[PDB]
C-alpha cells in the first residue's frame, strides 16, 4: 500500500557499475539486474515486447530475455506472501518484465538526440 | 536477504514522467526511498562531509531525512523483515546510510 506511492517502474544505476537495475513496485514487486546483449539495436518495434522467461547459468537462476537486447536477472521478490499458483506467478512476473523492457526502450527513445 | 549482497550497495533510480528520483540501499538496513531536491540544492561538493538529519515530518508523523545540502530522502520502505533490538542504534545506522547515499549522489553527478 506504501509501494503505491511509488511509480510502477524505477530504472536504476550505480557508481562504477556498467550493469543497470530495476525496481517493479506493483505485483509482483521485485528488484532486478539489467544487463545487455552486444547487438542491442534499440529500435522500437510495432509489435509489443514478447520476451522469454528461463533458467540460466550455474547454478540455475531465473532470468528474463527481452529478445531486444535487454536481460533481467538476480530477481529479489519484495513480497513476503507466497503465490498460490506457480504457473500464474511466472506469467505475472514475465508480463511485468515485458512492460519493463518496453519502458526501458522508451528511456533510450526519449534520450537519443 | 543474501541475494541483496550481489548488488551494489547504493542504487540510484529514476522514473519516466517523474521529477523526483529514487534510491535503494541493499545493505543493512535495507530500504527503498524517494529522493528529492529543494530550490537551494546545488549538487556542489560540500565543505564538510555529509552530516544530515533524521526526523519526523507531517501529520501523522513519518520518517524523513534532510541532508541539509538540499537533498531529501522520504517514503521509506524497509526491505528487511527483522525488527531491530535497539531502536536507537537502528536509527543511527539508518541515518548513517542516508548520509552515504547523499554523498554518493554528489559523487555520481560530479
Amino acid at each position: 500500500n506504501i509501494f503505491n506511492k511509488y511509480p510502477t517502474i524505477i530504472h536504476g544505476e550505480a557508481r562504477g557499475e556498467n550493469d543497470e537495475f530495476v525496481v517493479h513496485t506493483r505485483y509482483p514487486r521485485f528488484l532486478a539486474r539489467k544487463s545487455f546483449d552486444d547487438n542491442f539495436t534499440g529500435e522500437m518495434p510495432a509489435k509489443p515486447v514478447n520476451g522469454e522467461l528461463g533458467q540460466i547459468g550455474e547454478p540455475r537462476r531465473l532470468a528474463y530475455d527481452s529478445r531486444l537486447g535487454l536481460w533481467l536477472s538476480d530477481f529479489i521478490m519484495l513480497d513476503n506472501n507466497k503465490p498460490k499458483n506457480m504457473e500464474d506467478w511466472l506469467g505475472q512476473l514475465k508480463a511485468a518484465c515485458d512492460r519493463i523492457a518496453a519502458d526501458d526502450l522508451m528511456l533510450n527513445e526519449d534520450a537519443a538526440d | 536477504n543474501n541475494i541483496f549482497n550481489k548488488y551494489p550497495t547504493i542504487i540510484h533510480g529514476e522514473a519516466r514522467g517523474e521529477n523526483d528520483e529514487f534510491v535503494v540501499h541493499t545493505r543493512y538496513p535495507r530500504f527503498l526511498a524517494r529522493k528529492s531536491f529543494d530550490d537551494n540544492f546545488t549538487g556542489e561538493m560540500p565543505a564538510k562531509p555529509v552530516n544530515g538529519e533524521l526526523g519526523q515530518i507531517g501529520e501523522p508523523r513519518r520518517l524523513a531525512y534532510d541532508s541539509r545540502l538540499g537533498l531529501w530522502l522520504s517514503d521509506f520502505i524497509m526491505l528487511d523483515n527483522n525488527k531491530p533490538k535497539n531502536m536507537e542504534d537502528w536509527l543511527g545506522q539508518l541515518k548513517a546510510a542516508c548520509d552515504r547515499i547523499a554523498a554518493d549522489d554528489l559523487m555520481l553527478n560530479e
Partner: peptide
C-alpha cells in the same frame, strides 16, 4: 514538508543521466 523537485533542476539532472546511460550502453555494444 518534504520538497517536490522543481522542473528546472529535474530537466538538467535528467539530461546528465541520459548522457551517462548512453556512455554506459556503448561499452556493452559491438
Amino acid at each position: 514538508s518534504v520538497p517536490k523537485t522543481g522542473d528546472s533542476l529535474a530537466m538538467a539532472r535528467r539530461l546528465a543521466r541520459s548522457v551517462r546511460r548512453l556512455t554506459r550502453r556503448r561499452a556493452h555494444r559491438l
